[PDB]
Amino acid sequence: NPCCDAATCKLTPGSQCAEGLCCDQCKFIKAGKICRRARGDNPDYRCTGQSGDCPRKHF
Amino acid sequence: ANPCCDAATCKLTTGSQCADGLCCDQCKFMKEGTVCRRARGDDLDDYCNGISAGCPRNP
């Protein structure tokens, strides 16, 4: 994993995230990108620009 | 291989307290008062604090 130092279990320099639908090449995907389509009567889920994790439920 | 770290997620493996460090042994903290640095000059030795993997400079 280029995003993770396996020795220390710390993110490598420049890396913001190690995995996630809102992580691309160790960087956060931009705020607003649709990362999960709603199955029900809900809006779609979008990256926050500040996490590699795509939202799973609306508050 | 680092048994203490899942490099795909950059998370510690199940059961692990630490991944690296002079106060880490087999992914677990060494006990408080373990000597973690034998001073090479005139300072005091440094000691593990029981709850962290690093080796802090003796106050």
UniProtKB/Swiss-Prot annotation, chain A:
Disulfide bonds join 3-26, 17-23, 22-47, 35-54. A motif (Cell attachment site) lies at residues 39-41. Transmembrane segments: none annotated. Residues 1-59 form the Disintegrin domain. This is Disintegrin acostatin-alpha, processed form.
From Swiss-Prot, chain B:
Disulfide bonds join 4-27, 18-24, 23-48, 36-55. It comes from Agkistrodon contortrix contortrix. The lineage of its organism: Eukaryota, Metazoa, Chordata, Craniata, Vertebrata. Inhibits platelet aggregation in human platelet-rich plasma induced by ADP. Acts by inhibiting fibrinogen interaction with platelet receptors GPIIb/GPIIIa (ITGA2B/ITGB3). A motif (Cell attachment site) lies at residues 40-42. The chain holds residues 422 to 480 of 483 of the full protein. This is Disintegrin acostatin-beta. Residues 1-59 form the Disintegrin domain.
